[PDB]
């Protein structure tokens, strides 16, 4: 049952410009990237191919700063294709992640991992889907981060 991925990125303000801007390590990559203009749920679609998705996790953070969050999906099995949905709340994000992103110009990035123990090497998926460029100037001046 192959998988269809949707990253429903619920927002709070001027979200950003999700985009696979630069060529990266393309190990079993996403077949295509797409977006939609809806306001409440600006869902992003991408029908990538896993080999076995025992590990199915979306990391929305800054890899270099080691600040990342792990978002599990929601699986709906029609019986022919399985639909994965990861819902991200911009409001409910770690205070340190918001502060670090705002203080220094860089894009929050989302990496997808689909893998299994029984999978052959190089058949697992670890690739960066998008790089949100946040714009809302709403950050607290002082916090314990």
């Amino acid at each position: 049952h192959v998988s269809f991925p949707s990253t429903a990125g619920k927002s709070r303000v001027m979200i950003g410009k999700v985009e696979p801007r630069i060529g990266i390590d393309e190990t079993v990559p996403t077949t295509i990237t797409v977006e939609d203009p809806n306001e409440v749920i600006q869902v992003n679609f991408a029908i990538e191919s896993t080999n076995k998705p025992f590990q199915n996790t979306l990391l929305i953070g800054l890899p270099n700063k080691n600040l990342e969050m792990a978002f599990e999906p929601e699986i709906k099995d029609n019986g022919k294709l399985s639909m994965y949905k990861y819902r991200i709340d911009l409001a409910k994000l770690d205070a340190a992640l918001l502060q670090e992103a705002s203080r220094s110009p860089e894009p929050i990035k989302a990496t997808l991992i689909l893998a299994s123990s029984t999978a052959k090497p190089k058949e697992n998926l670890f690739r960066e889907i998008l790089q949100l460029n946040l714009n809302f100037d709403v950050d607290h001046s002082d916090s314990s981060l």
Binding site: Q55, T57, L59, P63, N66, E68, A115, N124, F126
Partner: protein
């Protein structure tokens, strides 16, 4: 000086001889206690004077033998008086006395049955971790790329205190796999393998989340890191003195 505590049931003392010998090689008065078949209890203090400078708790399964020799309150009283500690909690050998002492110091190690699994492994047999995950030059700065053999291991969730000194990171892909249906204890690079602590009194603790890191089998892969780690733990590597302000 140094006090070594070990259980002959879980792991014999010999498997960790090399590094102990190196300690002997640098004038370390090691005193060895076994907790498997001993009834007498070591007294860390004699009339408000600590009888040891350091302590090493080799891998032991949780029991009432540990809760009798080093109860949590005695560990915290030793640590406040500048004693240095070196813990080790493998999955399947996580004492409740260590786990609780370290939950008081901010470090939340994973409990038994939670084993870290990485699928993008160099060698599938055991969890090898590269040297790019080192997070502190002062504790140890790798001049060249090294792959540390960690065996089966656990992870630690860290609070945001000024005292916690993270030293090594789990692989970014890696996650904990509980036998039960509980969610993963740590999810990604927020689970730490090696961890350190330094009091406001400058006393130092270090937690290693594997039992195979310090074994003789992995000596070649993990000798430089291990020796610098032990030198740091015992206030022998990066101590600073302010003079004549």
């Amino acid at each position: 000086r140094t006090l070594v505590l070990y259980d002959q049931s879980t792991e014999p003392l010999e498997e960790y001889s090399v590094y102990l010998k190196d300690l002997e090689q640098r004038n370390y008065k090691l005193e060895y206690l076994d907790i498997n078949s001993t009834s007498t209890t070591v007294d860390l203090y004699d009339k408000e004077q600590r009888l040891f400078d350091n302590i090493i708790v080799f891998p032991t399964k949780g029991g009432k033998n540990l809760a009798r020799q080093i109860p949590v309150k005695q560990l915290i009283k030793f640590f406040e008086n500048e004693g240095n500690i070196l813990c080790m909690s493998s999955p399947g050998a996580v004492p409740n006395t260590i786990r609780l002492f370290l939950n008081e110091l901010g470090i939340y190690p994973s409990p038994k049955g939670h084993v870290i699994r990485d699928y993008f492994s160099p060698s599938s047999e055991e969890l090898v971790v590269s040297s790019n995950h080192l997070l502190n030059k002062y504790v140890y700065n790798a001049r060249k790329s090294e792959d540390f053999v960690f065996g089966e291991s656990s992870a630690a969730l860290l609070e945001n205190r000024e005292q916690i000194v993270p030293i090594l990171n789990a692989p970014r892909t890696s996650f904990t796999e509980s036998k039960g249906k509980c969610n993963s204890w740590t999810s990604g690079s927020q689970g730490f393998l090696v961890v350190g602590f330094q009091n406001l009194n400058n006393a130092r603790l270090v937690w290693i989340g594997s039992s195979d890191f310090l074994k003789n089998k992995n000596q070649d892969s993990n000798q430089e890191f291990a020796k610098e780690l032990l030198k740091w733990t015992f206030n022998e590597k990066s101590v600073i003195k302010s003079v004549h302000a």
